[PDB]
Design a protein around this motif. Sequence first.
Motif, PDB file in Angstrom:
ATOM      1  N   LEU A   7      27.307  -8.966  13.719  1.00 33.23           N
ATOM      2  CA  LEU A   7      27.175  -8.936  15.168  1.00 33.23           C
ATOM      3  C   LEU A   7      28.499  -9.310  15.818  1.00 33.23           C
ATOM      4  CD1 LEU A   7      23.833 -10.874  15.139  1.00 33.23           C
ATOM      5  CD2 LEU A   7      24.059  -8.565  16.014  1.00 33.23           C
ATOM      6  N   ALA A   8      28.789  -8.687  16.956  1.00 32.36           N
ATOM      7  CA  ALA A   8      29.956  -9.026  17.767  1.00 32.36           C
ATOM      8  C   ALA A   8      29.480  -9.244  19.198  1.00 32.36           C
ATOM      9  CB  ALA A   8      31.021  -7.939  17.694  1.00 32.36           C
ATOM     10  N   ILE A   9      29.410 -10.504  19.609  1.00 32.11           N
ATOM     11  CA  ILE A   9      28.996 -10.859  20.960  1.00 32.11           C
ATOM     12  C   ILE A   9      30.245 -11.073  21.802  1.00 32.11           C
ATOM     13  CG2 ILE A   9      27.789 -12.542  22.381  1.00 32.11           C
ATOM     14  CD1 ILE A   9      25.899 -13.035  20.075  1.00 32.11           C
ATOM     15  N   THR A  10      30.462 -10.189  22.774  1.00 34.78           N
ATOM     16  CA  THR A  10      31.602 -10.304  23.671  1.00 34.78           C
ATOM     17  C   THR A  10      31.293 -11.121  24.917  1.00 34.78           C
ATOM     18  OG1 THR A  10      31.049  -8.222  24.782  1.00 34.78           O
ATOM     19  CG2 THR A  10      32.503  -8.103  22.869  1.00 34.78           C
ATOM     20  N   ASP A  11      30.017 -11.269  25.265  1.00 31.11           N
ATOM     21  CA  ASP A  11      29.619 -12.055  26.429  1.00 31.11           C
ATOM     22  C   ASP A  11      28.216 -12.584  26.172  1.00 31.11           C
ATOM     23  OD1 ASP A  11      30.215 -12.848  29.349  1.00 31.11           O
ATOM     24  OD2 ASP A  11      28.268 -11.851  29.523  1.00 31.11           O
ATOM     25  N   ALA A  12      28.088 -13.907  26.050  1.00 31.75           N
ATOM     26  CA  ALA A  12      26.774 -14.500  25.832  1.00 31.75           C
ATOM     27  C   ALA A  12      25.870 -14.324  27.046  1.00 31.75           C
ATOM     28  CB  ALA A  12      26.915 -15.982  25.484  1.00 31.75           C
ATOM     29  N   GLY A  13      26.440 -14.346  28.248  1.00 34.74           N
ATOM     30  CA  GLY A  13      25.664 -14.161  29.458  1.00 34.74           C
ATOM     31  C   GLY A  13      25.210 -15.461  30.086  1.00 34.74           C
ATOM     32  N   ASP A  14      23.954 -15.835  29.845  1.00 33.79           N
ATOM     33  CA  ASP A  14      23.374 -17.046  30.410  1.00 33.79           C
ATOM     34  C   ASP A  14      23.030 -18.082  29.347  1.00 33.79           C
ATOM     35  OD1 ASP A  14      22.586 -17.631  33.367  1.00 33.79           O
ATOM     36  OD2 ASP A  14      20.946 -18.515  32.206  1.00 33.79           O
ATOM     37  N   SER A  15      23.404 -17.843  28.093  1.00 31.71           N
ATOM     38  CA  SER A  15      23.094 -18.746  26.998  1.00 31.71           C
ATOM     39  C   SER A  15      24.280 -19.666  26.720  1.00 31.71           C
ATOM     40  CB  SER A  15      22.706 -17.954  25.747  1.00 31.71           C
ATOM     41  OG  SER A  15      22.366 -18.822  24.679  1.00 31.71           O
ATOM     42  N   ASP A  16      24.104 -20.552  25.743  1.00 32.55           N
ATOM     43  CA  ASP A  16      25.122 -21.515  25.340  1.00 32.55           C
ATOM     44  C   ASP A  16      25.444 -21.383  23.856  1.00 32.55           C
ATOM     45  OD1 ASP A  16      25.187 -22.381  27.927  1.00 32.55           O
ATOM     46  OD2 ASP A  16      24.182 -24.297  27.559  1.00 32.55           O
ATOM     47  N   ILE A  17      25.527 -20.143  23.367  1.00 27.74           N
ATOM     48  CA  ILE A  17      25.836 -19.924  21.957  1.00 27.74           C
ATOM     49  C   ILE A  17      27.260 -20.367  21.644  1.00 27.74           C
ATOM     50  CG2 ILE A  17      25.422 -18.317  20.077  1.00 27.74           C
ATOM     51  CD1 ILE A  17      24.097 -16.446  21.975  1.00 27.74           C
ATOM     52  N   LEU A  18      28.206 -20.040  22.519  1.00 31.58           N
ATOM     53  CA  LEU A  18      29.604 -20.406  22.317  1.00 31.58           C
ATOM     54  C   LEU A  18      29.798 -21.917  22.406  1.00 31.58           C
ATOM     55  CD1 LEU A  18      31.528 -18.185  21.622  1.00 31.58           C
ATOM     56  CD2 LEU A  18      29.814 -17.278  23.212  1.00 31.58           C
TER      57      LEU A  18
END
Lengths: 193, 143, 94, 81, 129, 87, 150
Positions: free
Chosen positions: C83-94
Motif C-alpha cells: 500500500l502507498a498512502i499519500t494522504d491519510a485524510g482525517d485519520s492519525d496513521i502517520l
Amino acid sequence: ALNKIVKRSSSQPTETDLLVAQCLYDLESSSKDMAKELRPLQITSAREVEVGGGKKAIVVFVPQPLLKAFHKCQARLTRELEKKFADRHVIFIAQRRILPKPGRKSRVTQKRPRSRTLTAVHNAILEDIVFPTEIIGKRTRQATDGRKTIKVFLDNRDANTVDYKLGSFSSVYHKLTGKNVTFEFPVATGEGL
Amino acid sequence: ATELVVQSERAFQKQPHIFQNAKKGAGRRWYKDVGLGFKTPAEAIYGEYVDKKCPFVGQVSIRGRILTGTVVSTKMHRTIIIRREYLHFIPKYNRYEKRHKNLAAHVSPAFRINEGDVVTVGQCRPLSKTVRFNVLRVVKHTE
Amino acid sequence: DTINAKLALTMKSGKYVLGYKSTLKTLRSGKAKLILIAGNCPPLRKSELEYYAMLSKANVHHYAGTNIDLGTACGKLFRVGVLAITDAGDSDIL
Amino acid sequence: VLAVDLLNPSHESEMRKHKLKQLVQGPRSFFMDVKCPGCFNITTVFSHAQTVVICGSCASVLCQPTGGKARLMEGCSFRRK
Amino acid sequence: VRQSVLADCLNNIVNAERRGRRQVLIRPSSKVIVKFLTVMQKHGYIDEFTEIDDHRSGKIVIQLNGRINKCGVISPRFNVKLKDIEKWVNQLLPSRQVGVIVLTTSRGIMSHNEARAKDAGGKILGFFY
Amino acid sequence: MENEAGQLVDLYVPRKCSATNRIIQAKDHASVQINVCAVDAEGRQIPGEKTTYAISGFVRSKGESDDCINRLTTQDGLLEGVWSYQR
Amino acid sequence: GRMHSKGKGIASSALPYVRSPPAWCKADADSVVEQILKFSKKGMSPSQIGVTLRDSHGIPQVRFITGQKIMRILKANGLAPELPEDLYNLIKKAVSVRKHLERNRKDKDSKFRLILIESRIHRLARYYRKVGALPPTWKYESATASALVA
RNA sequence: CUAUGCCGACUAGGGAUCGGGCAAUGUUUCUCGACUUGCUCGGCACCUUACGAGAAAUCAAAGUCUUUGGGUUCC
RNA sequence: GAAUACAUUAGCAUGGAAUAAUAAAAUAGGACGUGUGGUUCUAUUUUGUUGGUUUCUAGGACCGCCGUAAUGAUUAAUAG
RNA sequence: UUGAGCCUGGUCACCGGGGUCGUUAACCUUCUGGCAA
Ligand SMILES: [Zn+2]
C-alpha cells in the motif's frame, strides 16, 4: 407611526392584534439586542380567556417556525408584556393544523404525519403553554364515576413567576381542549439527583 | 411477455372483419370496453398484437365472477398461474386454517406481469381446459 | 487502535494506491507518506520498497498478515502486496 | 403491606432501587464541569465515560474509564447541574 | 415475548385480589386495558386507577376494593354473534345475574348486556366477576 | 337477595371483613372481631360506646391482622403516629 | 431472553423523561451537526461517535438537541455507509471466525459459534431486505463474506 | 436426569454464595488492593411456611386450573 | 286459514370502524393547479348528406419550472 | 379523533339513535342543478 403595524400580522381583528403590534413596535424601539431579536418577529392572532377569578388572560397564536427566537426572548419579555397589557396574563401558544382521522368512506393518500396528530399537538400545546419548568411528571386519574383529571408535575426550578400563572394555564387548556388539568410542583428534600 | 414481431406463427395474424383499402390509409384498429368499470389500457388502444383470446381488441367477453389473486407462475406464453389465499372455518374447533387454490388465467400483452403483481381477473369463457379468466386490472409491486 | 482500523478510517477520506508499480510511482514522486508491506512479500521486493521509502523519507510498516489478509483488510477481492498512502485524510496513521 | 402508596413511593425507597425498577425509569449519571488545576478552561465530562477525555489546554488525563464511574485523579472541583 | 398485555393485567389483578392487597401495579398500558378497566369500574368492581405516563407504553396503578372473585381473558378472541352470548354466559359466568362478559363489538368495548342492547356482536375479550 | 315482593329472603347476611372486604364463613374459626371502647379525658371510658373491627381468618393466618388493625384505628381516629400510608 | 444464549440480563440505558438540552449546554444545534459530519468523514461508527459526543464533548442524547438521530443526520448529509452498522459488525465477526476456523481445523465450539453468527446475520439481512434499507438482491455469500465486510 | 420442553407476566420470609456496579470523613496495605457493612442486577443453590397445588411422596414451581383460555413444538 | 322460524356453510348487498391485518410522501420518484409556456389524440359538433387535413371548441394524456404550507422520519418496550 | 357543551323527536329519571354548531376540520372526495365571489 412609520409602518410596522400591518406587517406584523396577517388579518385584522377589532383591537387585539392592533394593540399587540403597536406595543411590539414600542418595545422594539429600544436599540441593541432588543431590536436585533425583535426584528424577525411575527404574530398571527390573539384570543381572550377567563379564569375562576376576575383576572383576564390573552393567548396569542405564534407561528410555529420561528419559535427559536422566542425560546430566548419570551423569558424576559413576559414581565414587560404583563405590565403593559393592562393587568392581563399573556400566553404564548403555537397554532398547529390537525388532520381528520381517515374514515373508510374518506380515502386519503396524503397520510397523517405524527407531528400533526391531535395527541401530539395537545402534548406540544401543554409543553408550550407552561414554557419554563419543563414537564417531569404526568398522571391521569379516573375516579369511580368516570371523570378523568390529569395532573402535570412541573420542574422545581424556576417555580417563581409561574406559580400564579398555572391557574391561567389550566383555564386556557380546559377552554381550548377540555381536559381537567391541574399543575403541581414537587418538593425535593435534601440533595442528590 | 417480450415484444416480438406479431407475425411469429405459421399463419397470418389479423383482426377478424378488419379491412384495408386505398381510399382510406390501410385500415382501423378495433377495440371494446369490457365494462364493469375496467378501462381499456392505452397500450391496447395503440398497440400491434392480435391476441384473439384477449378481453380487449378480441372476441372474448367478460361475464361471471371477478376474482383477485397473486401471480405464482408466469412461465407460460400469454397465460399465468395465480394463487388465491383464504381462511377455511372448521366449526368443531371454532378456528380457521389456511387454504389455497391455483387459478390459471390469460394475460394480454398490454399488461407486464411478474411474480407478485396482484392481478384482478374476470371470467371470460373456457380457453384451454383450465383458463376461464382474463386479467383486467394489475396492481404492480414497483409503481 | 489497530492498523486494520486505521486503514478502515483512511479509505473513506484519504488518498491511497494499490500494487507494486503504483507504489513505486508514488515513492518516486515523493507524495507517498506511508507504505505498508504484506507479510508474504518477495524479500527482494521488500528490500527495494524499503530502499525507495528510505530515500523518499516515507514511513515503512511490515505488519503481520499475508497478502490475502492485507487485501481483505484493504476492502478488495484480490491480493494486495504493498500500500502507498499519500494522504491519510482525517485519520492519525502517520 | 396490603396498603402501599404506589403512586407516591418513599424517596428513600426509590433511592434503594434499581434505575429501571422505579415507578419512572431514569438515568442515575450526571454531567459535571471540570477545570484544569493549572488552567482556566471548562470541560464537560460524563460520569460513566467510556473514552479518555483530553483537555485542549496543558493538562493530564482528565478521567480514567473504569467499569462504572470514571476515576478522577487530578485536583479538580466539579459542579453538577 | 409478551403476547397479550391484557392477559398480564388481568392475571396481576386477580393475583393481587387473591393475596388481599388493596392496590396493584400493571405494566404496560394500552387502550384495550383502559377500556376494560372502565367497564369493570362502571359496573362497580374496580375503584379509581391512575395511568402513569412515562415516555413508554405507560403504567397503571389500580385501587382494588375486593368484591372480585375472578377476572380473566378469553384467548384467542373468538368472534361472538348475538346468539352466542347466551352460550358464553352459561359457560363462563356463574349465573345469569352475576358476572360480566366484555366484547369488543363494532360500537366499541363494552359488556355483553350492553352489546346485546346495541344489537351488535363482536369478539370476546374477557370476563370478570 | 330480594324476591318479587321486595322482602329480603335468606338465612342470614354474612359479615364482610373490614380489612380486605371478604365474606366470613360460618366455620371461619380463625376470624375474630375485637372491640375498642371510647375514652374521655382522664380515663374513665364511657360504657356502652365502642367500635368493633372484624378480621378474617385468612388475614390473621397471613399475619396482616396487626397492620390492618393499625390502619383501621388510624382511619377511625383512635390511633396516631403508628401507621403511615407512605411507604 | 437472549437470542442465542440462556442469559436473562436486563442491562440497558434509561433515557431521561426530559426531551430538552441542559441549560448550560448551548449546543446551538448546528455546531454539533458539523462535529458529527467531521466525526463521520473519517469513517467512525455512528454509535462510537455518539459515545464521543456523550463523553468528551459532553453533549446529551443527540436527538434532544439536533432533533434527528446520528444515522438520520449522516444519511441526510450523504455520508451514509453502504451497509447498516449491525449488519457490518456481524459480517466482520463472521469473517474473523471463518478465518480462524480455516486455520484451526479442530475447533467444533468455534464452528458452532460461527453457525449461530450465520443464523443471526441471515435473519438481520432478511429483515433489512424486507424493510427496503438494502437492494432486494442481497444474498449473503460465504466465500465473498470478505467482500461484504470490506 | 433436574426421571421435570421453550418464551413472557405475577405470587412469602430468612441467611449463605459467584460475577458486576453504587455508597462508607468503617479497619487494614509497602493508590490501589485485602476485610466488613448496606443497596441493586444477573446465576448456582439452602432453611422455614403453605395463601396455593397434588393421589400422596412432595412442589417458589409440579402455584396463579370445575373460579377450567398468554404464545408454541414433542409425546 | 292453509302462518312463522330454522337459511349466513360458500356467494351478493346495506350499515359500523372496536379488535387484527398490506400500502400512504425518504434519493419526495407526494394533495401540489378557473396555473406561469407547449405537445398529442378523439370527434362526443357546427362549416352542404357521405370520405379526408387544420384546430376555435368539450375532453383523456404528457413535458423544465412555478412556494400554495408548519412541507415529510411515533416514544425508543425492566422486547431484540 | 379525543374531551367537553347541545338539542331533538321516542319506550323501558335512564337508555338507543341524528347530527353540525366550534374549540380541533366539519361529511374527505368525484360528477351535476341552480346561486356566482
Ligand atoms: Zn486534562
